[PDB]
Design a binder for this molecule. Sequence first.
Ligand SMILES: [Mg+2]
Ligand SMILES: [Mg+2]
Ligand SMILES: [Mg+2]
Ligand SMILES: [Mg+2]
Lengths: 453, 453, 453, 452
Amino acid sequence: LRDIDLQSIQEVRNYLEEAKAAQKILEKMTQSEIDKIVESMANAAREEAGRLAAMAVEETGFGNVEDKTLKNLFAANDVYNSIKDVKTVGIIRRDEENRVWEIAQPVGIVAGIIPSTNPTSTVIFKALIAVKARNAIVFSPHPSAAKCTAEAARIMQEAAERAGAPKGLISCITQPTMAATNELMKHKLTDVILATGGPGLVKAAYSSGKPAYGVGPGNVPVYIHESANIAKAVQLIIQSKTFDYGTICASEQALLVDESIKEKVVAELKQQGAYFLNEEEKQKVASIIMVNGSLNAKIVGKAPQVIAEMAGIEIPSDVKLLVAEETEVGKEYPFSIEKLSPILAFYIVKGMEEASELAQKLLEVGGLGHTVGIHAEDEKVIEAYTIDKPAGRIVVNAGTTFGGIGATVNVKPSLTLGCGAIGNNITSDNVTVTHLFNIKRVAFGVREMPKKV
Amino acid sequence: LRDIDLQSIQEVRNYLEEAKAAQKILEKMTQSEIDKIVESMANAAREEAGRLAAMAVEETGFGNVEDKTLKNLFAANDVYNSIKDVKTVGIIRRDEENRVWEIAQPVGIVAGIIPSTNPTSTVIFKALIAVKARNAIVFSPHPSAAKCTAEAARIMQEAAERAGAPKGLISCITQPTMAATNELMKHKLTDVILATGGPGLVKAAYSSGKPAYGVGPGNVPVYIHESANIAKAVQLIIQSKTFDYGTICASEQALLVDESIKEKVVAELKQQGAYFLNEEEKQKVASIIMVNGSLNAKIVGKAPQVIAEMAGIEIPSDVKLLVAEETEVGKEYPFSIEKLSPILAFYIVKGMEEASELAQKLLEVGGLGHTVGIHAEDEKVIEAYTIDKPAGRIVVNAGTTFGGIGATVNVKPSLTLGCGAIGNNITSDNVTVTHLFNIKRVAFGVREMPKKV
Amino acid sequence: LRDIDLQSIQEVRNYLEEAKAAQKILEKMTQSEIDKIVESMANAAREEAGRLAAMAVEETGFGNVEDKTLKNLFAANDVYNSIKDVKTVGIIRRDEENRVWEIAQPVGIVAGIIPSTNPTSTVIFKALIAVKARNAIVFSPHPSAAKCTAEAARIMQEAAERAGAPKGLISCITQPTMAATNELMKHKLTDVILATGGPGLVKAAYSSGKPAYGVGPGNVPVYIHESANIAKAVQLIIQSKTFDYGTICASEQALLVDESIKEKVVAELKQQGAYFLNEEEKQKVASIIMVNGSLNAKIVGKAPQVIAEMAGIEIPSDVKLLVAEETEVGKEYPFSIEKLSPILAFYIVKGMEEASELAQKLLEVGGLGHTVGIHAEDEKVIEAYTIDKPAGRIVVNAGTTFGGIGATVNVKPSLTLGCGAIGNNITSDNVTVTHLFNIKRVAFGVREMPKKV
Amino acid sequence: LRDIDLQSIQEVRNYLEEAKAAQKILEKMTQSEIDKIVESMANAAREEAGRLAAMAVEETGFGNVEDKTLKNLFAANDVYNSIKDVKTVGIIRRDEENRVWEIAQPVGIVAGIIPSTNPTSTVIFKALIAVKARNAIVFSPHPSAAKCTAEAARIMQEAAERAGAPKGLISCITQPTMAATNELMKHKLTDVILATGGPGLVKAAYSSGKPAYGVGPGNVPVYIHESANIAKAVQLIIQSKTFDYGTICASEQALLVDESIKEKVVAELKQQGAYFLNEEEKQKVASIIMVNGSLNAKIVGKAPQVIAEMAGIEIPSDVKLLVAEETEVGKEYPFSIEKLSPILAFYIVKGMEEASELAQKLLEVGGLGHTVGIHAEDEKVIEAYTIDKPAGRIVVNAGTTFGGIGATVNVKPSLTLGCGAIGNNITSDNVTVTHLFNIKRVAFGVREMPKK
Ligand SMILES: [Mg+2]
Ligand SMILES: [Mg+2]
Ligand SMILES: [Mg+2]
Ligand SMILES: [Mg+2]
């Protein structure tokens, strides 16, 4: 075979056949044996966190090395700790009085689609949950992130083998193509797809004929209520928003601010490193946010100074993020969409009801089912505001990046955030190890069936 | 007539838009208002169980009215009782230690695909679980069951309306066509597909671009170990196998019997109404079990006497099931496949190990992930036999029809039995109300994110 | 509004069924009855040519009324004269020495796809050749020209009918949709597709499952050799290029001019109304020629003054066309593409070999198999230049608009110009009446077949 | 084996790229150089006719070696003779009074789809007409005839190359797959599809995005009018019908016979080797004509004795064809469909009018646009009968096999019989060399364009 599309198809087929053999071997191991493999994988991810981070920044041009290192550690530490004690081998629950017990059943071979924004960390995370549940996994990288994705996969497989795992358990397409992605998603041997990517790739996953856990995009609106701790709220928002220069789907995109505290919030934002664009600077930044009707890849995950330069504006070197005041919401209004960069929209609101109506509109521009935030000290207000928001993660008094993924609030640590039915997803959960094994129920007859009505 | 396809598309579009408006109204109600609607629906199903049963037998030619009535009552009583106390409105859980509230979120509009074998009971089952989780539902019948399916939906909607539900909540396609099925599965307003049907239609649901809960087919092997109470085992098996003349996917298809108790088992089966075919009779029956290389629809749900007539053999009028001693397994051995009728294969085995190898082979002929059975009093044998069977329902000392669906063993009452990844499904659960709402998590800041490494 | 797609499908189905019935009636008529019908149609077109021209300019904003009026007359007169004496009924050829005779066989129902640039004239031309060949025809308009296209079809039907034609012989989709176009191209009653449109629609026609005659796009290069009558060649070029403000695919897009007459040709161009853009103005005009990577629709068929304003430059009010001197060819050099407007590129060449090289490059930019031109009085040069050019119409000493369609050179009058295999078409012919009937051959035994080798 | 699909796709891409290069070199040759290449090809086909015939019978199980040898010679002789003097290089026509020239332009690369019934003869025919028009051609065989089809191709290429043709001009997919068929039909470099096969491949060819010449199936009804020379009609009918055991699409499938001569026709048929089935025998043969609502592949191109064994009937050795009297027409009546084997239907009619009505109904069962036949000496009846038949080939006083392909009546020699719009084809012509080059017209200004 000479041509790269055919070669990539053959490569996927080889990987899946090898994965099938590897998973048969893995399924026979004890819980201790599995847990030892997962622990070794987590240890290698930890050791390799910085180096993988630097590969990703260099290859993709997104983000910064210190934050990608922390993203990798989040996968190596937080994800690992949330699954290390989960029972995944044999009988995992007995219910003596109902005369049922539950047996864990691996799904088999998982197809992992990896994003360009979180390439190495998503590999670490998916490799850990897949292998803990006793599956093999075959990865498909984004073409912009092919080399670092593959290196992360190799490190996981080699760490797994050192602890006794079989060859071919963890693999990665080396030459990404549409043909190979299509083969991986539709192949006979593929059992479950974990599709972490854009809406089109997720749509393909749910068109594949295979069971799939997809995600949806975010466009996270955050309400700062007049009861907020303003300095703390601003601190949390800025740390979350500028993390890896805004590459995570759960990051803040718009602030909705009660008019009674707007002056204080602005001053606090400015003090903590935000640059407020004037009407002319806003137009110039706006004109590079979108090209040809969608987000400009060239601003994704870029420092505020790089964005400033691209837009032809002039800012201080210590600026942490750009902010623009906004009144409108929609695709024709670039500051109201998901920006995946250190840029925030700033909407003034009269109170909670106007905030909710704006939040609903912003979610409808490419954020349904994903994440919202609120900063407030009034529980009544928090309860009334949050109850009807279409998001699987409703983050209170925390940065939405770190809350969404379960770093700083107690949802399951994950880099695959299901957006529920409203987001065209099978679940609203943070996807984790329990999504990658089936439960079999052994159940005894305890009632008699009548055969007369 | 030329344009029934276009009219059926239009009808789907009308139902979904009416379903959209209805669900919005439903979603605003209290738990008690929802529960009153569900209760009224259950009551009406109970009252109409016999009339729906009769419509289904006459229209499809499958089964008998007594058993179909019981099947409807299973949906009206067992399913109702298993969901009536489930919380589905608002905050369903507050986790004070983890600082997380769980909010129940309806998926929206469910597309319910209905099989020709369990037409009215599946409608009852799906309508109850859909409405209890605060959804609208649009049904799609098999063409050979369009009238009884639509009548069951009509009765569910009228019952719901009587107790306060909005018009348009529950609807059913009246003119089934490929175009309409396609429209329903792919339409922008459809949120989740419940696909109960053949592997073809389920594959279509997982190809639709939408989240789906599919099923897989059964081909249930049942092991009678030498330790079994033989009279009781045979009774449970015959009651289950002949229920509705064998139309339920969980019903027994092959018995695997320890040689040491073969003669007793055969004699007990004969005593309880089984007719063992001789070699000439076997071959005549085998000829009408499949046409092309697939199950012959004309024997599905037929009394033994009808089948005898079809195969041109004669049998006593009191015969309850046909049995055929067999040694081979494969698509080309018609007695080893799923027969969906009162025909049972009979395999002799030396012990448990040989039983497992045959069970495994039978499941591979179109039963993976579905159901298995075993009859035994030796607990260690039970434990050893059951641990490695690829079936979501592993039924011990009960009829597999009634065990699988949760009538006589404690799995969730359901007529949509997921077969997990091994059967191309997103779950191995008995599908129930918890599969039709997403959980949103309101989660408070409880940890700090480290700024550096 | 929601169901306009479904209504348009039903509309197509009605038209096709009525056309089938109409065509059956028409096929039984004599040659003289057919010719009377065709004559009536042509007279009606001749009478309506001005009115339909004004409708098309009004609805599409392309071109001008005087030139569209002449375009309609081309179809009502030239096309009509080229077919009125063609034999299309019964035996059309007798070969007595070969013992064979030919019988004309109508193709049946023709699907005619109509462009936005030539909406009324293409309808006239197609209706004439279809009915002359004893076919029915169902038209599909471009959306931006639906009204004037439908009105042209109506006038043709009513004229046919006045002369004795059946109802439903000529029809037109009134609400164009993708669904209707698809239905028309693929319907079981559709016999032959005339696809006059962009490469996307023609590709759809060759993917329809049906026999199709398509076109390709033009990008016509014209060589002015030093032997040319310069005043006459510039006059021919200008009249052709500015006709309907350059909407026709066969219109000149680039001039290739011998260095030795460069100054004379430039001067002659200016004298006859050409405005040569300077570097400043070039860049401004280029900015509006392409939006995204394709031709800007807003310049199509616009007077040079409109284009000047759009580009924000000032030109004298008597300017008939803009000209830009160029050296590069390719899809990123906007002056080298097909411009469908009164803009002309202008290349200097040392002589014939460099002219050929450039013409080949220019046709590769979206003109393959369509049209080329040369002005020259040297016969040897004409022969050597034309022999190897990939164009079905090779126009000598004439404007290419009028030449390509057969107004001023002797190719068959047509508005559907096949670009041959090189342009992804079944023919390189100017499509006309002989493409719309099949020939049947009645042939007698004249030789004996050997029985043995 | 797992990835033969991928290998076959790569093979197609290699052939197309080499085809491209080859055609570019071929296009520069003189008419004289082209004609020498074509002649050399036709010579080699002639020499290899018997050998190819034996391979095809062995590989496919269809027909017999003698008739297949004749079929290959028809391509090597009749097709060659019909194209060898056609002008195809450069300027092919000049017109001083209209001031127009015509230049022949090769289509480029031809994808030739080859049926299982005529596998080697169709390769010879398509290669000759494609290379004569100065094209390259890539063949796609039916899986049942892969080896003999590739060998026919190899022989043409070798012969062409001996006479100076470039490498890669003529090629053939060696392992047929769906993937490879799809690739060849849809590839960027493919210019024209010649689709000779069942309605399904033909549909795929007109669904490919590419210009295509398809065929349609035959179901040829033949009318024997009371004015016919009966002994001669029967002979022509039997020789045509039994040729290669009935594998050619133009072959007779049903006789429509004037009541007034019925007895003589029956007697004459029997005398010339026909076996008339009794009612019981008819039911048994009917039972194996159709399998699963379509023509049973297992009777295609089989001797009548072989068909007799399959049906459980007993017939003499010297029988040449089976005949059944029939009254009904439709898919539910196996004797009324296209049988591609030495089986004929026998209908009695009162006269021409019932014959036409019957002929129309038989064509609507899978024969539209293809071929029809009549045997008669009354010129007026011939004219009256033929004028309204929807067939591109209307064969008079000849066997329809040999008439339809142009062996024994003057239509262009061809094994790709277009069935017109009524047969879902772009033409009703016997496809030949002129369908494989475009005409470019060099045309001079002769008129002025006005205003108002
Ligand atoms: Mg699998
Ligand atoms: Mg929705
Ligand atoms: Mg037709
Ligand atoms: Mg080409």
